[PDB]
Amino acid sequence: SWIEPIISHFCQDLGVPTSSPLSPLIQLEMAQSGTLQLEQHGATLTLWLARSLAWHRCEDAMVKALTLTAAQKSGALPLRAGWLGESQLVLFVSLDERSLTLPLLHQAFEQLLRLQQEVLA
Amino acid sequence: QNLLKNLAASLGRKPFVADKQGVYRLTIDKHLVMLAPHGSELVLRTPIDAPMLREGNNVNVTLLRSLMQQALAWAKRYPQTLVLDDCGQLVLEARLRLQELDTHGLQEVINKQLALLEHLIPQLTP
Amino acid sequence: XQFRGESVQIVSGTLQSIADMAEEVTELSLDKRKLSDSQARVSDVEEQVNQYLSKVPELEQKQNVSELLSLLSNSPNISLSQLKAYLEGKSEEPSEQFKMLCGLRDALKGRPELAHLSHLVEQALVSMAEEQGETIVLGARITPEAYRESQSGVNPLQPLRDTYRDAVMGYQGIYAIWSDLQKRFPNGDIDSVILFLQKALSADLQSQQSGSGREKLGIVISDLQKLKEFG
Numbered sequence: 222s223w224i225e226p227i228i229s230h231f232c233q234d235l236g237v238p239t240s241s242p243l244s245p246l247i248q249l250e251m252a253q254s255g256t257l258q259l260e261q262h263g264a265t266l267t268l269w270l271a272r273s274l275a276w277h278r279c280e281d282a283m284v285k286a287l288t289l290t291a292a293q294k295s296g297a298l299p300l301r302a303g304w305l306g307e308s309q310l311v312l313f314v315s316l317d318e319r320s321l322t323l324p325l326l327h328q329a330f331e332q333l334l335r336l337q338q339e340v341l342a
Numbered sequence: 343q344n345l346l347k348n349l350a351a352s353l354g355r356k357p358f359v360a361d362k363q364g365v366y367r368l369t370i371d372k373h374l375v376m377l378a379p380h381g382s383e384l385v386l387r388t389p390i391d392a393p394m395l396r397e398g399n400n401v402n403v404t405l406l407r408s409l410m411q412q413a414l415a416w417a418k419r420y421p422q423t424l425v426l427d428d429c430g431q432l433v434l435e436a437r438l439r440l441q442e443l444d445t446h447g448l449q450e451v452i453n454k455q456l457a458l459l460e461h462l463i464p465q466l467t468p
Numbered sequence: 469x470q471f472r473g474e475s476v477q478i479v480s481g482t483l484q485s486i487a488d489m490a491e492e493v494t495e496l497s498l499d500k501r502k503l504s505d506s507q508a509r510v511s512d513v514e515e516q517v518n519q520y521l522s523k524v525p526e527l528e529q530k531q532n533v534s535e536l537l538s539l540l541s542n543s544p545n546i547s548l549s550q551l552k553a554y555l556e557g558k559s560e561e562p563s564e565q566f567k568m569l570c571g572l573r574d575a576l577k578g579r580p581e582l583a584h585l586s587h588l589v590e591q592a593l594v595s596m597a598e599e600q601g602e603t604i605v606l607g608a609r610i611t612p613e614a615y616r617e618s619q620s621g622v623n624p625l626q627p628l629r630d631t632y633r634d635a636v637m638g639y640q641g642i643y644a645i646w647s648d649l650q651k652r653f654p655n656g657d658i659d660s661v662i663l664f665l666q667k668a669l670s671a672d673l674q675s676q677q678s679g680s681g682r683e684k685l686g687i688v689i690s691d692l693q694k695l696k697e698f699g
Contacts, residue, residue, distance in 0.1 A: 262418055265418075267418065280406075283403065283406050283410060284401065284406070284426065287406075287424065287425050287426040288425070288426045288430075290423055290425050291425040291426065291427060291435065292387075292423075292435055292437055293427075293428070295437075299421070299437045301413065301423040302413065302423075302424075302425075303410045303411065303413040303414025303415075303417060304407055304413075304414060305411065306411075311414050313414070313417060315421070317442065
């Protein structure tokens with residue numbers, strides 16, 4: 222993978238060393254925010270950010286996540302929302318490999334966390 | 343719009359007409375596909391009627407969870423986003439970057455839009 | 469690792485995608501599909517409706533503002549189906565429902581805080597023009613003539629309009645139309661209904677350049693001449 226340097230550098234910017242070569246799927250565990258995966262699939266890099274919610278937090282999160290990802294309410298990136306099983310809110314964004322840059326990857330990550338934060342406020 | 347001119351011509355049709363805000367509206371096998379340029383994106387939108395979405399004020403969580411689970415399941419292969427609009431009604435959207443979009447690509451995303459609608463609509467109706 | 473004070477660290481090994489775990493437990497192309505430019509269709513239907521309804525200044529202003537009323541409050545979450553139901557509540561005639569919609573849209577043009585309602589009304593206009601456009605245009609087309617007839621005798625407006633539209637859209641032959649006339653105008657003046665139809669359909673015929681269209685209207689027109697001899 223030619224995009225390894227960008228992913229490696231991103232991880233190093235978070236203070237996470239990685240050994241080369243990197244897997245096509247990198248998983249970063251965040252103490253509160255959940256599980257971040259950086260997945261290379263086809264000519265795409267998708268960031269998936271999954272977080273398990275307590276039952277009494279799930280309904281409002283679903284509605285807000287759908288509401289706040291509408292194009293009219295969105296920013297520069299195509300952040301999307303989904304769900305896994307009983308209780309995991311999943312927020313995600315796909316990036317075209319051919320125009321990926323480190324600043325783009327950083328803002329994809331930051332804008333996913335920001336969204337999650339507004340969704341759970 | 344060059345792309346919509348190209349698509350109309352490729353289908354053998356007269357050019358499509360936009361409203362005053364530049365939004366196009368096509369009904370394709372009974373499904374409305376709105377195409378709305380904003381800055382550097384073109385956004386496709388199809389509002390969905392989903393009577394079972396809420397009984398009175400009560401949102402059907404089981405259904406919402408199921409639809410969001412599907413949204414994740416299609417994410418790798420379809421660019422569409424399931425969202426709620428300003429009326430709190432479901433809408434299937436796709437945000438396309440004009441920097442990268444050609445007529446082929448527009449047609450493909452339209453094909454994908456209709457494909458997902460045909461999958462979803464039966465779940466939200468009789 | 470850290471981000472904004474939150475600890476972060478890698479987990480390695482054989483992993484499976486969050487998305488693939490979703491897909492685990494959960495293309496016909498455009499040239500083969502029916503397609504319509506709904507912006508053109510809605511504009512065409514409105515043009516046609518307005519042209520006819522201008523011939524019979526019999527407003528819907530009351531319905532409009534009463535409908536306006538039901539939207540500032542009405543629902544927290546307004547759906548198309550709800551809007552359709554309210555239109556149908558005010559009038560059973562599709563052409564009137566469409567006119568009311570046009571009136572609502574114009575009533576919302578000025579009111580940028582209700583742009584969400586404007587958006588819904590545009591959806592409904594589209595749906596009606598696409599799914600009921602012929603029914604709408606025929607209802608408006610016959611409205612002036614149906615109103616003149618109904619204001620001059622015992623044949624009411626809606627049955628006249630429905631009888632004309634049925635004859636154009638789905639004629640079932642001479643014995644069926646006679647039965648329909650008896651069902652719809654049991655205490656009416658059926659000779660007068662027949663003449664109303666002969667006139668409207670013969671007018672229609674004068675503009676039909678089709679071959680097939682001229683022939684279809686011909687059949688109904690020929691049948692009506694015979695039915696007039698039932699009295």
